[PDB]
Each structure stands twice: as structure tokens, then as C-alpha cells.
Amino acid sequence: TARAVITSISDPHDYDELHIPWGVGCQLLKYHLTNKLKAKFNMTTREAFSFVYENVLQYNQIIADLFKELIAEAAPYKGMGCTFHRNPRGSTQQFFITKVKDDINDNSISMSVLCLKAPNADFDGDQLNLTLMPDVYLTKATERIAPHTWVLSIDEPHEISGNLELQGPVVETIINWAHEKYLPPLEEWL
């Protein structure tokens, strides 16, 4: 139901979080914004459809607050359940939309930085499909394809698969910290 390139969430986040851009979330949640425009405001469906399509390429505070409201209505979940496919178990996972980007020029579905290994992290020329789940029945049913279902290795009996291992700079910043001549040697410490 959506298709865009991917970037990374290089921040404190959770391993199942999607940040959809403004233009994708305005055309995917059109019938979700129309219900809130017909319930909170006294708009008709024609004025609500004219209000959604006008602010597709333009930021306004009302659509952003209704996006935050529509994220906050999911009480037992972090957000709305989705399945983020990839055409080439770890190729289709389940995430939760927790943020809509306020920047209009940013047109990319930013994915988890620790889930970039079970699929191949191609930032250059890989568009990935997104499918919105209508109800919580399918959100419960697609829990079998999750970012915790590829952790255990399928090759060796008691091992964790190599898609959990950290990336280059985040390893090197721990190597610069832990492996450093900071303390005196043990026989001179005494």
C-alpha cells in the first residue's frame, strides 16, 4: 500500500519502529484523518477530502496533531501494525508506525538500525513495500513474522544468528572506550 526508500534511525529508539514521511502518511491514513475531521471538527466528507489532499505537499499543525492522536489511540501497542516487505523469515517483518516526519522534503521510510541485517541494508536503490493492517486480528496474526523471530540461528543448534551483530562505527566507539590504556597494570596498581 506504500513504497519508498529507507534510511536509518541513528537515535535512541526501539527495534520495531517505523517513521513514515509526510506525503506517504497523508495518503495512507486518508480515511483515518477523515473520521477525525468529521468527528472533532464539523466538516463534511467533501471538505475533509479537500483538506487532506491540500496538505499533502504542505505542513500544517492540525494534520500533525491528528497524526499524533491516531498514533496515541493504539493503547496496547506502540503504534499501527504494518508488514514491511522486501522483494529480494527475515525478509518480511512486523513494525509499528510511531512517528510521522514533519519535514516535507524527506521522503523515506526510516527503519531500525539493528534490523538492517536480516534484510540487506541497501540505502542506494532499494524501494521496499509497506502494507497497513486494518484491524488488530491481523496485527495479532502477523506476529509470527517479527524482528525477534530471526534471532535464533537456523544453522547451529545453540547459537544466535549473525544478524544481531552491531555495525562498524558503533563497535569502534566501544573499542575506543573499553580497549584503552587507561588504568595502570595490575602488579603496579598494588
Binding site: 527495534y15 534471532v151 566507539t173 573499542i175
Partner: protein, 373 residues
């Protein structure tokens, strides 16, 4: 003597703002087994963050194997722990300690723990380790500049391996490569260099550093043809002859283009097996109690394929048995059932519930032949 004494679980019940605000000193850590690990604060702060699944179960013993520096054991003689190297922090090393924690929980309670909870605890522990290590370590950033090249380049043993080199495959690839290979593994020479400490931590490969800090040797063509004269210089001090730069131009792009074009042709090999392996179906745990056991000859190269099986000895889940390497052995397989978990082996406990075992076996066979080419 002045070594503080902590515990294995008393650091795990400590909050993050109190764990990170620990003193910087050589201390002792008491584990639930009969051992005691000597270590420093910056390594035990990283080891506690790998024990996140152990934080939920508060009656599980924590052995000495879970620490990063588990070789230093406080013994009776003071020379067994005075000058001992520790475990190297690797991108693979933080994963195996979370594996040790989740299988310590899976072995503490006897085979009654859903592994989905352990895998969710493993990905949550990796997430909490990431969210702690990026925020708390903001001043320890590895940099690279012009000064870092001029410390590996200016070593007198690396400059000796560039002069008086015999231009053959032996005099380069066994003498000049080895003369810097034996000093790249020396843990005394390069202290604090971003290239060498990243090479020791598995983030840099020595095969790309040999062609940079030493001579490049004998590149090929569209077909594998040695050009009878090697490249004289490396990539740090560049290559500016017509001959050697044209041979490196034939080695650079045309090899990688056909290492790209030969990976969509193997996509046909696995789909038919992936479709035909779906006839076998769901795997339910238990034991079929069948007296049908097939004999299989053991070889040294198939010992790692018997890593999880069910041995039958005098009426055993490992893959490190050096013995029993030429003896034909009777153990149970999937060819007898009245598919159970004991017959399939202990590889099946890493598979989720709603996953076809033949389909995941076809994916496991398919990815291994494409990871080589």
C-alpha cells in the same frame, strides 16, 4: 589488598545510572560458581549489559563463563592472574554472551522455557546495549586523519618489508606479507591506532591492508592470467606506471561486475527445492519412542553437521567430540517416527512454531552456496 569485591547479580540489580557511575579501579567479581574474575570497570560494565535476559529470572545462577575476561581466575598462586590478556571485544563477542545467558536460563530450568521469550529478550538486550552505548559514550569516537596513516607507515619493520623484495609469488606473498602480518598481530606496537585496533576487533581485514601498506601482487584479467611482473608499490604510496595501473584497472571493476552478474543465475536453483520440500510439515515436540535407529559413519568433516543430535549409548548434545571420529555410530534420525523433536535434533528448538521445517531447510541450503560466490 585494594581490590573491591562485587557480585554477579548485585551488579545486575543495579540501575543504569548507578552502573555507569562506578569507580575506575581493579576489582573482584564473585560469581555463583567457585570462581572469581579479576577485571576492570569498563569491561564489567559491558558484560552486565550482555546479561539482560538474566535480569528477569532472579533465581538463576550466573557462572564465570559469562564475563568477557573469564580467563583471569583468582587462584592461589599470584602469577596465574598477574599478567594475563583478556577477551577481545568483537562484534561477534557481544552476541555469544547473550547466547550464553539465554542458554543458561534454558538449562537452569529443565527444558521448560519458550525460546520465543529468550529471542525477544536477546533482541531487547541488544537494543538496550545499543541505546546505552551510543548515549553514554559520546566522547570516545574513533577518528581517522593524515596522522593515523603516518604511524603504521612509519614503522621500521613495515618499511623494511618494502625494500629488497624478490618479485615472485613466494618473495612477496610469504616473506613481505608475513613480515607485516607478524607485527600486525603484536599487541605491543600500535597502542591507540584506529586502524590496528579496528583490525584486532574484526572490523578491518588484513587482506585489504596487505595491498595498501605492502606490495600488491599479480592481478588477473577477464580470465585468470598472471602477468609475470607484480606491482611494485601499494595504495598508500600510489601506483603511477602505465603497466601496473592498467593491470590494476583490469583487476578492479571487471572482477566485481561478474561477481555481481553470477548471483541472479543461482536464484533458479533453490525455488524448486523450496517448493518440493513443503510436503514435510509441522514439527511438534516430544519423543516418538521408536526403536528404529540408523547407523551413520562419522568423518572429521561431518562432525560439525552432527552438532545437535541424539546419541544412544548403553540405553550428549555437543559437536566438539574429537574422538568417535572413525567409528560408525547408531543414533536416531527423521527416518523413523510413529517428525518428533528428538529425531530431528536440537536444531529444531531454534525454529518457531508456525514455520515449515523443509522450507527453512531449503533456505538454509540455498543461502550457503550464495554466500560463497
Amino acid at each position: 589488598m585494594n581490590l573491591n569485591r562485587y557480585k554477579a547479580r548485585d551488579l545486575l540489580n543495579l540501575s543504569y545510572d548507578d552502573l555507569w557511575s562506578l569507580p575506575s579501579e581493579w576489582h573482584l567479581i564473585e560469581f555463583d560458581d567457585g570462581k572469581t574474575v579479576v577485571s576492570v570497570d569498563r569491561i564489567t560494565k559491558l558484560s552486565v549489559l550482555c546479561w539482560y535476559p538474566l535480569k528477569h529470572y532472579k533465581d538463576c545462577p550466573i557462572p564465570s563463563d559469562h564475563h568477557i575476561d573469564f580467563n583471569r581466575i583468582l587462584t592461589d598462586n599470584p602469577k596465574d592472574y598477574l599478567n594475563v590478556e583478556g577477551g577481545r571485544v568483537t562484534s561477534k563477542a557481544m552476541v555469544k554472551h547473550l547466547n550464553k545467558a539465554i542458554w543458561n536460563i534454558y538449562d537452569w530450568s529443565g527444558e521448560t522455557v519458550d525460546p520465543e521469550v529468550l529471542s525477544k529478550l536477546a533482541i531487547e538486550g541488544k537494543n538496550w546495549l545499543y541505546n546505552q552505548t551510543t548515549v553514554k559514550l559520546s566522547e570516545y569516537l574513533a577518528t581517522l586523519s593524515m596522522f593515523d596513516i603516518a604511524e603504521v607507515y612509519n614503522h621500521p619493520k613495515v618499511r623494511e618489508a618494502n625494500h629488497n623484495i624478490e618479485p615472485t609469488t613466494y618473495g612477496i606473498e610469504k616473506i613481505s606479507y608475513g613480515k607485516v602480518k607478524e607485527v600486525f598481530n603484536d599487541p605491543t606496537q600500535f597502542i591507540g591506532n584506529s586502524i590496528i585496533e579496528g583490525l584486532r576487533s574484526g572490523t578491518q581485514k588484513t587482506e585489504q591492508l596487505l595491498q595498501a601498506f605492502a606490495w600488491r601482487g599479480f592481478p588477473t584479467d577477464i580470465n585468470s592470467d598472471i602477468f609475470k611482473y607484480p606491482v611494485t608499490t601499494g595504495y598508500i604510496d600510489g601506483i603511477w606506471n602505465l603497466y601496473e595501473n592498467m593491470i590494476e584497472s583490469r583487476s578492479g571493476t571487471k572482477a566485481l561486475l561478474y561477481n555481481k552478474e553470477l548471483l541472479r543465475v543461482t536464484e533458479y536453483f533453490n525455488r524448486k527445492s523450496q517448493l518440493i520440500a513443503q510436503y514435510v510439515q509441522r514439527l511438534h515436540p516430544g519423543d516418538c519412542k521408536t526403536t528404529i535407529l540408523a547407523e551413520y559413519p562419522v568423518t572429521k568433516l561431518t562432525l560439525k553437521a552432527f552438532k545437535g543430535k541424539y546419541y544412544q549409548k548403553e540405553d550428549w548434545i555437543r559437536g566438539n567430540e574429537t574422538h568417535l571420529i572413525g567409528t560408525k555410530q547408531k543414533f536416531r534420525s527423521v527416518f523413523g517416527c510413529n517428525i518428533c523433536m528428538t529425531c530431528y535434533g536440537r536444531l529444531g528448538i531454534n525454529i518457531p512454531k508456525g514455520t515449515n521445517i523443509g522450507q527453512v531447510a531449503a533456505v538454509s541450503m540455498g543461502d550457503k552456496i550464495t554466500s560463497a560466490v
